Curated annotation (Swiss-Prot), chain A:
Ubiquitously expressed. The modification Phosphoserine is found at S107. The gene is TUBGCP3. This is Gamma-tubulin complex component 3. It is found in: Cytoplasm, Cytoskeleton, Microtubule organizing center, Centrosome. Component of the gamma-tubulin ring complex (gTuRC) which mediates microtubule nucleation. The gTuRC regulates the minus-end nucleation of alpha-beta tubulin heterodimers that grow into microtubule protafilaments, a critical step in centrosome duplication and spindle formation. It comes from the Eukaryota.
Curated annotation (Swiss-Prot), chain B:
The keyword Cytoplasm applies. Required for the recruitment and the assembly of the gamma-tubulin ring complex (gTuRC) at the centrosome. The gTuRC regulates the minus-end nucleation of alpha-beta tubulin heterodimers that grow into microtubule protafilaments, a critical step in centrosome duplication and spindle formation. GO terms for biological process: gamma-tubulin complex localization; microtubule nucleation by interphase microtubule organizing center; mitotic spindle assembly. The chain holds residues 11 to 75 of 82 of the full protein. Keywords: Acetylation, Cytoplasm, Cytoskeleton. Belongs to the MOZART1 family. This is Mitotic-spindle organizing protein 1. One of its GO terms (cellular component) is centrosome. Its main location: cytoplasm.
Curated annotation (Swiss-Prot), chain C:
It comes from the Eukaryota. This is Gamma-tubulin complex component 2. Component of the gamma-tubulin ring complex (gTuRC) which mediates microtubule nucleation. The gTuRC regulates the minus-end nucleation of alpha-beta tubulin heterodimers that grow into microtubule protafilaments, a critical step in centrosome duplication and spindle formation. Plays a role in neuronal migration. Component of the gamma-tubulin ring complex (gTuRC) consisting of TUBGCP2, TUBGCP3, TUBGCP4, TUBGCP5 and TUBGCP6 and gamma-tubulin TUBG1 or TUBG2. TUBGCP2, TUBGCP3, TUBGCP4, TUBGCP5 and TUBGCP6 assemble in a 5:5:2:1:1 stoichiometry; each is associated with a gamma-tubulin, thereby arranging 14 gamma-tubulins in a helical manner. Gamma-tubulin at the first position is blocked by TUBGCP3 at the last position, allowing 13 protafilaments to grow into a microtubule. Belongs to the TUBGCP family. It is linked to Cortical dysplasia, complex, with other brain malformations 15: An autosomal recessive disorder characterized by global developmental delay, variably impaired intellectual development, speech delay, facial dysmorphism, microcephaly, and varying degrees of cortical malformations including pachygyria, thin corpus callosum and subcortical band heterotopia. Most patients have generalized seizures. Ubiquitously expressed. It is found in: Cytoplasm, Cytoskeleton, Microtubule organizing center, Centrosome.
Length: 107, 65, 57
């Protein structure tokens, strides 16, 4: 796929609105992605792994801070990806407070 | 083949571990939205862009709808 | 005239205010050492008139 129409697919997954109903949301997506069209940011995924472990200690669940460490190893173990840093940076930035996480299935 | 289904396995595993990572960091993104974002970062794209967009698009259906 | 007087006064005022805020910005990033910044504005005036703006790339 081309990235520009991929933005409009993303807008119809997040919002229930169709891609012909609105064009303003897609225009804002074009506003931010355009003139940032190429990757120029740098990754330091070592520091961000060390920052997820401090967060999982902060929950005061310490067995799960080391379970994430072995699940974080597996992304390098397969290694079919582009950057391991990018999706993890996205998923860290959108965080809300589970207050201490009153459950986790642990797969 | 075998290495062609093992390549199809190696995305399906990673999408399953990232699904655990998505709920323990508490985002509002589910698996369906996750698959689009993982394709975008498979091509390579600023996550700093994507974060500001989704902070607005999620804010575009809880006060505008 | 006195209008050209006022014009030069306003030029000097704008430039001095801008440089005052820039110097306080360049001193604020540092680190009984904060007594310089606390003494210079003991009641405040031109302390921080523009908030630190930010956006993501």
């Amino acid at each position: 796929k081309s990235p520009n129409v991929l933005l409009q697919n993303l807008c119809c997954r997040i919002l229930g609105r169709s891609e012909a109903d609105v064009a303003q949301q897609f225009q804002y997506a074009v506003r931010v992605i355009g003139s940032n069209f190429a990757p120029t940011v740098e990754r330091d995924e070592f520091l961000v792994a060390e920052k997820i472990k401090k967060e999982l200690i902060r929950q005061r669940r310490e067995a799960d801070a080391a379970l994430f460490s072995e699940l974080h190893r597996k992304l390098h173990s397969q290694g079919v990806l582009k950057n391991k840093w990018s999706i993890l940076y996205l998923l860290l930035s959108l965080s809300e407070d589970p207050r201490r996480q009153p459950s986790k299935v642990s797969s | 083949a075998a290495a062609a289904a093992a390549n199809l396995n190696a995305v399906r595993e990673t999408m399953d571990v990232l699904l655990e990572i998505s709920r323990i960091l508490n985002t509002g993104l589910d698996m369906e939205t996750l698959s689009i974002c993982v394709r975008l970062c498979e091509q390579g794209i600023n996550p700093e862009a994507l974060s500001s967009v989704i902070k607005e698009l999620r804010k575009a259906t809880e006060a505008l709808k | 005239l006195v209008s050209g007087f006022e014009a030069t006064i306003n030029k000097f005022d704008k430039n001095f205010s801008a440089h005052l805020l820039d110097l306080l910005a360049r001193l604020s990033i540092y680190s009984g050492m904060a007594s310089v910044i606390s003494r210079l504005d003991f009641n405040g005036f031109y302390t921080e008139r523009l908030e630190r703006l930010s956006a993501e790339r």
